[PDB]
Design an enzyme around this catalytic site. Sequence first.
Site, PDB file in Angstrom:
ATOM      1  N   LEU A  43       0.820  -1.202   0.000  1.00 23.40           N
ATOM      2  CA  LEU A  43       0.000   0.000   0.000  1.00 23.40           C
ATOM      3  C   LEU A  43       0.860   1.261   0.000  1.00 23.40           C
ATOM      4  O   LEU A  43       1.943   1.302   0.627  1.00 23.40           O
ATOM      5  CB  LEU A  43      -0.961   0.019   1.172  1.00 23.40           C
ATOM      6  N   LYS A  89       6.280  -3.086  12.465  1.00 25.13           N
ATOM      7  CA  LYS A  89       5.281  -2.871  13.509  1.00 25.13           C
ATOM      8  C   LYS A  89       4.020  -3.698  13.267  1.00 25.13           C
ATOM      9  O   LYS A  89       3.522  -4.364  14.176  1.00 25.13           O
ATOM     10  CB  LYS A  89       4.975  -1.387  13.649  1.00 25.13           C
ATOM     11  N   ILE A 107      -5.315  23.490  24.119  1.00 26.51           N
ATOM     12  CA  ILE A 107      -3.995  23.038  24.590  1.00 26.51           C
ATOM     13  C   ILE A 107      -3.358  22.140  23.541  1.00 26.51           C
ATOM     14  O   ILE A 107      -3.890  21.084  23.224  1.00 26.51           O
ATOM     15  CB  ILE A 107      -4.052  22.248  25.895  1.00 26.51           C
ATOM     16  N   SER A 145     -17.895  15.706   8.077  1.00 28.20           N
ATOM     17  CA  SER A 145     -18.399  14.356   7.978  1.00 28.20           C
ATOM     18  C   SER A 145     -19.923  14.270   7.787  1.00 28.20           C
ATOM     19  O   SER A 145     -20.423  13.278   7.301  1.00 28.20           O
ATOM     20  CB  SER A 145     -18.021  13.636   9.263  1.00 28.20           C
TER      21      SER A 145
HETATM   22 MG   LIG Z   1     -16.813  17.986  12.036  1.00 27.83          MG
HETATM   23 NA    NA Z   2      -5.860  20.192  22.184  1.00 27.68          NA
HETATM   24 NA    NA Z   3       4.301   1.137   0.388  1.00 31.71          NA
END
Ligand SMILES: [Mg+2]
Ligand code: NA
Ligand code: NA
Length: 326
Positions: free
Chosen positions: A53, A63, A97, A171
């Site tokens: 990919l 990993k 923050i 979304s």
């Molecule tokens: Mg949103």
């Molecule tokens: Na934040």
């Molecule tokens: Na790749």
Amino acid sequence: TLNGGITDMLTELANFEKNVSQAIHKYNAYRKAASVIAKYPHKIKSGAEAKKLPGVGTKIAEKIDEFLATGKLRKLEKIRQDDTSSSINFLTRVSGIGPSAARKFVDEGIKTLEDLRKNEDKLNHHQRIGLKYFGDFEKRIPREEMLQMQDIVLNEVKKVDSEYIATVCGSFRRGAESSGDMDVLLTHPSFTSESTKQPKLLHQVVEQLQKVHFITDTLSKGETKFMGVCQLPSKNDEKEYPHRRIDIRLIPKDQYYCGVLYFTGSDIFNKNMRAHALEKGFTINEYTIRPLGVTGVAGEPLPVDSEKDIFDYIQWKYREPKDRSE
DNA sequence: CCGACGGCGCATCAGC
DNA sequence: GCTGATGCGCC
DNA sequence: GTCGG
Ligand SMILES: [Mg+2]
Ligand code: NA
Ligand code: NA
Ligand SMILES: [Mg+2]
């Protein structure tokens, strides 16, 4: 979610790199890998299969192999045990923050929700409000509630001026069943790329939505962008709805398509699309798509009549909002 | 290898 | 105050 | 961390 464990692992790693390491490209590479693995329509059997990919490389393949054999990642277990990383990762969860303020609070022993609550006077306004609605902001918004919020925002906007158009993006526009917050594109004929024939176009909408108790707080506010909080009205004796992040973005009316492309997203889709623009020698922002010049300088705005035109230029087949959830 | 990785709005700060 | 950098947020 | 040149 065939590869849910994997992409959870990667997202966690991306969050580490962003919040702790403050290595933004590492955050990006991770989120990218996660994203291409998430839409890969097979249960992954090996690092070496993931590596195929685009965006999965050597380290992430290793990993993945360690994750599949043992169910865990030793690198994450360590990061999870570190007090300083857990502290920073927690603080950055408050809106306002980020990595720097987070590390800076730890330097002072302000490191838990209780520390923040006894120390409001050490927070700027955005941060104070993010702490205020800390729990609420963790909650997703079901589409049902997105639909009531929409009628409200569309109806109140129409009341100030019948010529504002508000369009819910994010979304929600991608057809998601639940949304993290409400993103609202706003246009008015008076505000174009040529002139602003009316001041306060955004202000007036905000005031209005405050006057009906829909908008309850403001994180930041300028001439084109509002970043704040809102809440649906609840009926007699009902518990209240959670407070919800709302974002309102006023875009010149003649640049609606670049604006709506931008605000529909997703963030990763945008990054990839814009990245591809560059390889095709164009650049796209929320306003325009411009050619890249020989030198490296942005030429003039190209004419755009639909979202599709934007895709055409960069030699991409159209992708509906619902197929942009990368 | 190794340069480049999306783009920009607002709040805040330093430096003048 | 202005200008430009840095922080943080949005997709 | 990954990728194209
Ligand atoms: Mg949103
Ligand atoms: Na934040
Ligand atoms: Na790749
Ligand atoms: Mg939002």
